[PDB]
Symmetry: D3
Subunit: 271 residues, 6 copies
């Protein structure tokens, strides 16, 4: 298993920029060509929510074209900036197992040594996340029938407060429901999230829980300052690789930088 | 607790650049001024190893001046690029609790809600890591005598293979002995490492185990390619914060990037 | 009083760039978010003319949206690239006291310790400036009733030749009319202008007279070369602050640069 | 008359960078080659002070070599970072009219339509400015014996507070004594200063009074915040030109930027 | 004779980017303003094929506007990405001597000391080039009546394999036909081509044969790797100048870089 | 045969930058690591002259270390910036076939399908080139005794004027003597040169004759302007490859640029 994992693409309509100046459509198209160009090709690409910025039809048309140009199977979940019905209408052909019901979008993937669980934490009419009882019970059934086989969950909102003054009040509001599931099921070992536009990681029992950077703009972590900042600090994604018994996640830079060069011992320490 | 955690500074001697062209001394002096300029000030800075590039006295002179200009308590550990005796001679004044024996540099910090354990995984005459008999024993003594207070270890070499073709053969050779400590001691929940010049994370039992980016040059993760690559992809560090019961780690960019601006709902979705 | 003062925005229609390659709409939207993000928030924003590039309705629609997204009261005046009638139609809702008559756009602001006088130097069918007799007589009435209270004038065209070979032939053609007013009224102490895309300052009696940089492209000052150059040298604006009895103007960079860091005496002069 | 006016070069010793990371010696050598490359050649270059960073002989050796490679007559004055005796020893050969007494470095230039007056506002053992009894007196003698020929003063410290929270407490402490000279002497119409690393301008009676940007690092203007910030925002200098009766100052960018291109009416507004 | 020679502009429709992220329309408009701004003004501009990217009408509308804004006579030829009929419909007014027949576009220019021969190597329904027999016989007539006067050919596809693994299989397929002409006619001394997005030169008898860089994106030369790479390495064009008996070609950078400065012997070798 | 061909490295002494600001030593060390990192490895690297800037021993010490870290056989020749005796003392160990006589440094390489001839066109006490009586004779001996095997010459100075106003007066003064050799010897088909810091090419009989860009700073081509300009436009080198019967030269960028990505037909022309 090799997965490329991006999020918070924030697509705008054709010929619009985010906030009028951040060319998200071009930046994401660059990211898509970067992923198509990888030497070690992933089995699939995950996009963990906030696919579009305003939940508008014309933004989904752009998303559908640019994400549709990935030469990979996709697993897509919504974020709070998404519109559940339009998300399903435009993006379900790219990710068929989302289903038919915009209020119950989720699926399990059983192709790999670790099972993948994709869920919808977005709630209409708010930025905060919410796990519906049907999501929690579907998750219980998945984890129970899964038995010993390890599981990872992908969702948009982090299920616990991470100390980020801007992002915490809009985390998953009833994230305790997922925490309770990691306590029940030792099989559940990874939860990956978007929303925060930041690589921030923590551990609850046997679960590693991490948020991801955005593909374009980032949000700095502040503990005591509430100003809604964003910046254009370097974009990245997470590659997830099954390495024997270990699920390993590594950061893959989406920036354009100098290098690589080859290490040479004589050049390292001249005599 | 707030810790700034940097790694793999690779200082060179006063007039010199790494490989002749990468100005590590200037890049690290910038990092140091960035850390002194933070609005949310850390309690301490951790430098997890490969402090100098060649193990030479003149590189340690530069490291002592530049790391000495941090306005923070420091916790310093060696990497394989370091020389134990010189590391002690030059850097112990910046981290007195290392001790007096260059063969047994270790310390436990008990000031915070989580116990911090700093060890030397470097071995003279090789790039691979090794945990001495004394280290393994001292580590076990800290955990055994430490009750239910959680512990995090800082060491230079990853204690397990991560699938990185360049970096795996030179991980901690008897790292499985530390993995046996995570199995027996549920209070051991974090292991942070340098060596890899890459953010790569995994979970083993309750332990989250992560390598860090370097402050200057990075090494990309390849699964099959053993070509010794490095590049100048964006540098960053890890901030570690205690957030109630949670140890949270977030990536702090050390690059210079546009921003920040403030989010405005009307600019986000114009009508 | 704190004023942020920008000019020569040169807005184009949606999806056009200036000259086909300078993204003025994105650059100005960046500037607008920068101004919204200021820690020391101005009382108002002044835009001293050449709001649009071609005087076209679709350019005013873009200007109205982007300038309308400033979280500040605005004072707007036209430049030669503007169309007086369309300027009034689209931008008067953003600056109500311009009035109702496109040929007599001007206003006085009496909110601060120094009174602010906004005038229209643009003339239909030419690049040169012109002060109509109704503007001059309105100015005489304003300065006479103002008495001892200091006054600053904002206009698009500089009222005297500044030695700039490109810009001088298209300065205010009858600028002597304003010069004559500074001679009559010792109360008149600042005249700020756009047009030149350059920070160029001079003094006539008690008046400081300055042109401003553009928000996007600049024009270099040449004394003896007549080629109509423009470049993308660094953009800035002027902040105007009342400091006791002093009106002070300082340059605020609109570029994205490294820093800030904090000054430290030990780092400044190592021993 | 054409003068290029730079300020606050802050040279370091031969192998050294400012704060360990800002290459002032290289940045200043670039500035020097830019000045030698101008098509419109100045009659003289003014360096208004803080020539070196630490007042050390080896910094003056670098300053003498780099400033000595200007193909222009120089007018040099000290700042608080300078050492008077060493400034005289090393730099008087580049500006012979400074004199022979390191405690009374002053000169009047009478070659142009405006008299130029160069003074030392620096005081040993402090960052604030001070006008010695002898300086104030000599300044008054120049103005009193100078009739109706206009005068401009170059000095390092601003003679009045500008509202800059970082820089105001370290302005010229008895600067009001120079303000008394502008009140009594209408021929005194320009005062130009370093110290602030910022273009900030004000008018007092007939005098335009301005601080300059540095050639390398800048200090932002804050009204309330006293945190000692500096940044690497775009560097520039001031060109001073005599244009008939007008002394005109314009900002000349020292950055490397795209351009110039030529304005074309058809490219500006396509049909 | 001075010719500016660009190629492979790859224009897209209004508001589209190449591959969704490379702003070719803006980049080419920059190039056009750079060419308009040249101090040594060319007699004509040559564009050697792949004017548009997809052969679509809306792309030709953009090409026609941007190339139409060059203040020079143009010589335009098609490449494989072009559509012969639409090329003629939109671009023939910019280059009248292309003619009236989209299948037989070619012309001779006899204005200079060397005659210029523009031909169409593009073939409908393929990327490979093809020289029709009517092109070869027209060329024979041109070279025969030309006699002793030297000749240069401009065509899109290189007439021989250059060892480029990506580009060779799509060179001119029957390029031997042109090679046979250089063997017959010692008068034929230059053949310039687009297609390769790379400055690559060779010699066959008395003919210098060269491909050109693109105005925007480039393609790296690989000998043994077949992956269809492109990059944004620096763009340039070729200036062709008649220097007495010599046709000389020099590379003119279209990038924005630091400089120029003037060489000074004292600054070069300090003493 | 694959040759990497660089030129005009202009090394400075250990702590020094070219003109005080261009870090040639670092830029060349980067070039060297780029060359060692190529996937398609050259058989040899050619350095066509102006190896050091000032002809000083300490510059040769740097050149020997940096050029000595190339993992390739080297062919080195002098330029006018070089000192013959010191060039031999320091660099002959890197290119033993230069010989033992600093006045007659020449060698023929016969390893490949094309004979390579390396000569010294530099003359002590001038910037112009000169072919010694012995060189011309030895060159003729190589060609006369060499039969129908093709030959390429590497020399520092162009053997003919190229129309470059700065560089033409300092070309090879008796270069016409080498032109006489191309006339008599059809096997002589390539002459490659440094000196110009510009890719400029021409053909004389069967010989393709080209100058190279420098590895660091470039000199623009001007026809009328003699002002001694240099700039930091993109650096590159020439790769020379034997492709069957064809000697092919391609430009290899030494800049750091975005890319590469992979061409995709669907991303190229979306529907
Ligand atoms: Fe988001
Ligand atoms: Fe979100
Ligand atoms: Fe390391
Ligand atoms: Fe290491
Ligand atoms: Fe304007
Ligand atoms: Fe204007
Ligand atoms: Fe200063
Ligand atoms: Fe100062
Ligand atoms: Fe092409
Ligand atoms: Fe092509
Ligand atoms: Fe050279
Ligand atoms: Fe040379």
């Amino acid at each position: 298993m090799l997965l490329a994992h991006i999020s918070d693409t924030h697509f705008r309509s054709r010929g619009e920029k985010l906030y009028g100046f951040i060319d998200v459509n071009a930046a994401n198209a660059d990211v898509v060509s970067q992923l198509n160009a990888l030497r070690e090709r992933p089995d699939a690409v995950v996009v963990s929510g906030d696919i579009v910025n305003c939940g508008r039809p014309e933004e989904y048309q752009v998303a559908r074209q640019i994400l549709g140009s990935l030469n990979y199977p996709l697993y897509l979940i919504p974020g709070n900036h998404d519109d559940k019905a339009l998300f399903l209408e435009y993006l379900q052909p790219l990710c068929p197992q989302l289903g038919s019901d915009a209020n119950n979008m989720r699926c399990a993937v059983d192709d790999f040594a670790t099972r993948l669980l994709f869920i919808d934490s977005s709630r209409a009419g708010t930025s905060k996340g919410w796990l519906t009882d049907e999501t929690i019970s579907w998750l219980e059934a998945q984890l129970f029938e899964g038995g010993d086989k390890p599981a990872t969950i992908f969702m948009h909102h982090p299920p616990l407060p991470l100390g980020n003054a801007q992002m915490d009040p809009i985390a998953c509001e009833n994230g305790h429901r997922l925490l309770a599931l990691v306590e029940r099921f030792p099989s559940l070992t990874r939860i990956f999230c978007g929303h925060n536009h930041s690589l921030t990681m923590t551990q609850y029992r046997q679960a590693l829980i991490s948020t991801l950077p955005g593909t374009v703009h980032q949000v700095p972590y502040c503990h005591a300052d509430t100003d809604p900042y964003y910046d254009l600090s370097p974009a990245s994604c997470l590659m997830h690789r099954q390495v024997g018994e270990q699920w390993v996640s590594y950061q893959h830079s989406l920036a354009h930088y100098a290098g690589p060069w080859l290490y040479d011992e004589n050049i390292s320490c001249p005599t």
